[PDB]
Amino acid sequence: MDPPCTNTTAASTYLNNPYVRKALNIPEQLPQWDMCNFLVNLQYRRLYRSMNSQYLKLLSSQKYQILLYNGDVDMACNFMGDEWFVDSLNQKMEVQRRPWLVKYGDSGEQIAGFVKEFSHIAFLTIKGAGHMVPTDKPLAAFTMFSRFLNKQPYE
Amino acid sequence: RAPDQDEIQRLPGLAKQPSFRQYSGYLKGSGSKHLHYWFVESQKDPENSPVVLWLNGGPGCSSLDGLLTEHGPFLVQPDGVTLEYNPYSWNLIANVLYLESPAGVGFSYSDDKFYATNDTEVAQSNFEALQDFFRLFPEYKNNKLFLTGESYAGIYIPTLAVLVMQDPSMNLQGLAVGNGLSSYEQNDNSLVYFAYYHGLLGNRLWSSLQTHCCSQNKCNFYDNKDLECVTNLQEVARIVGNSGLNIYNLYAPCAGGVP
Ligand SMILES: Cc1ccccc1[C@H](CC(=O)O)NC(=O)c1cc(OC[C@H](O)C(C)(C)C)n(-c2ccccc2F)n1
Ligand SMILES: *[C@@H]1O[C@H](CO)[C@@H](O[C@@H]2O[C@H](CO)[C@@H](O)[C@H](O)[C@H]2NC(C)=O)[C@H](O)[C@H]1NC(C)=O
Numbered sequence: 001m002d003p004p005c006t007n008t009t010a011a012s013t014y015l016n017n018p019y020v021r022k023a024l025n026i027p028e029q030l031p032q033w034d035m036c037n038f039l040v041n042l043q044y045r046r047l048y049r050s051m052n053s054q055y056l057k058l059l060s061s062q063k064y065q066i067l068l069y070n071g072d073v074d075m076a077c078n079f080m081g082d083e084w085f086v087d088s089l090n091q092k093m094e095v096q097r098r099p100w101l102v103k104y105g106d107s108g109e110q111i112a113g114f115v116k117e118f119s120h121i122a123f124l125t126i127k128g129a130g131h132m133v134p135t136d137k138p139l140a141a142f143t144m145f146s147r148f149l150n151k152q153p154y155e
Numbered sequence: 156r157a158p159d160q161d162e163i164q165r166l167p168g169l170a171k172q173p174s175f176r177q178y179s180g181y182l183k184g185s186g187s188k189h190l191h192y193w194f195v196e197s198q199k200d201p202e203n204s205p206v207v208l209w210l211n212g213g214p215g216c217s218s219l220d221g222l223l224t225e226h227g228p229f230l231v232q233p234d235g236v237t238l239e240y241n242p243y244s245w246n247l248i249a250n251v252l253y254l255e256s257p258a259g260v261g262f263s264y265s266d267d268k269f270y271a272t273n274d275t276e277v278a279q280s281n282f283e284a285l286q287d288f289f290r291l292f293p294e295y296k297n298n299k300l301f302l303t304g305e306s307y308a309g310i311y312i313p314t315l316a317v318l319v320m321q322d323p324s325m326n327l328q329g330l331a332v333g334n335g336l337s338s339y340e341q342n343d344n345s346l347v348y349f350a351y352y353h354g355l356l357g358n359r360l361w362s363s364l365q366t367h368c369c370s371q372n373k374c375n376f377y378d379n380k381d382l383e384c385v386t387n388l389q390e391v392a393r394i395v396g397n398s399g400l401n402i403y404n405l406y407a408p409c410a411g412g413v414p
């Protein structure tokens with residue numbers, strides 16, 4: 001039920017508490033809460049090998065802003081694969097690759113990662129973060145999320 | 156105006172009551188699928204703040220991981236009882252919809268209990284779930300809609316966004332994917348390069364990879380049929396995923412120790 005090298009006991013112990021299930025309006029007859037369902041994964045039929053066509057379809061309308069962000073210390077879905085992917089989409093208004101900053105309390109401005117921008121699409125690295133960017137770098141993740149929602153530059 | 160029946164009254168583990176309204180219930184997917192949602196309204200101006208859908212990957216993993224361990228308003232503590240407020244919560248500036256998807260994931264279920272699915276069925280079920288969300292929360296129909304996700308949601312989100320873009324009633328404004336699976340070929344090729352340059356493979360394994368898997372500059376570590384190449388890639392997969400290194404964070408320890 002748990003992916004390798006991960007410990008999901010804290011969330012599992014919390015969500016399996018009967019009073020928590022009642023507060024979350026969960027019907028009592030439903031089975032125990034598991035972080036990852038092994039049976040769903042085993043029976044899952046993967047159909048697409050690339051999202052190239054999906055992103056090109058979304059970018060054609062020029063109505064939506066797209067963001068691909070990766071923690072640079074992750075090996076499951078490494079930053080380079082997604083950087084290669086965004087670059088391969090060959091979009092207009094290509095900007096020079098630049099670092100993006102985050103202000104840390106009294107520790108001052110720090111490089112949170114690097115931004116590669118194109119028209120309606122940007123690729124971002126989160127320096128020192130793994131597969132779960134908001135868990136590893138919560139301040140950098142919020143700063144990036146805020147800039148994304150408000151359509152502001154990532155720098 | 157809103158499903159008052161789905162509203163969370165007093166959540167256990169919280170020392171202080173939230174300033175925002177929160178809901179937990181079910182969204183109707185395709186067929187007999189009932190997808191469990193946990194919706195957290197914005198801490199600042201919920202009526203005008205954007206609606207943000209969050210999907211975790213797997214396939215088969217719960218989006219409640221995103222809430223309780225990643226960017227939710229409160230995070231679960233190691234005791235598995237206490238919840239502490241998150242000062243970097245994504246709900247500070249957005250109405251965040253955490254959806255346990257597909258059916259069978261976490262508290263989500265189906266009446267026939269058949270959880271065998273695919274990319275196309277998942278996108279359509281997620282689309283119908285979003286339609287149900289807007290029927291349950293009609294005051295959020297005109298709000299800016301953003302579709303966000305992690306890992307396998309790199310497939311979930313763009314496929315869902317393709318369906319959402321065809322629906323003019325949905326005010327789609329963008330999409331964000333965190334450490335997402337966008338291409339198996341781009342991911343597999345980059346990982347072998349990542350492994351060597353992060354010091355997981357030696358010069359002997361790399362020289363063998365460069366000589367056998369590659370032609371001049373271009374390397375094929377995805378669907379190559381060269382004999383020494385397939386052998387070297389089997390060793391790369393063993394070092395990266397089954398040797399005691401945390402695949403999700405190279406510099407973090409492996410929970411439960413090295414096998
Ligand atoms: C690491 C983690 C921790 C908590 C929640 C979710 C996840 C991530 C998804 C995310 O980042 O949102 N889960 C996975 O990366 C993952 C991958 C899995 O399956 C492995 C692949 O399918 C493979 C056969 C291609 C290697 N799972 C997973 C799903 C169900 C049961 C066990 C698992 F490890 N889980
Ligand atoms: C996996 O996670 C659980 C939950 O965080 C860990 O258990 C906690 O351990 C600390 C320290 O002993 C206690 O204060 C908590 O009360 C425990 N919580 C629960 C729910 O038991 C557990 O040690 C971790 N296991 C591994 C192998 O990392």
Ligand SMILES: *[C@@H]1O[C@H](CO)[C@@H](O[C@@H]2O[C@H](CO)[C@@H](O)[C@H](O)[C@H]2NC(C)=O)[C@H](O)[C@H]1NC(C)=O
Nearest residue numbers: 045046047185186271272273274275276277279
């Ligand atoms: C993906 O899953 C869907 C849903 O299970 C499949 O579509 C159904 O397939 C059955 C059996 O052939 C038909 O009886 C249904 O009428 C189909 N439903 C729809 C909406 O088309 C679909 O075939 C699966 N795709 C793949 C490639 O396996």
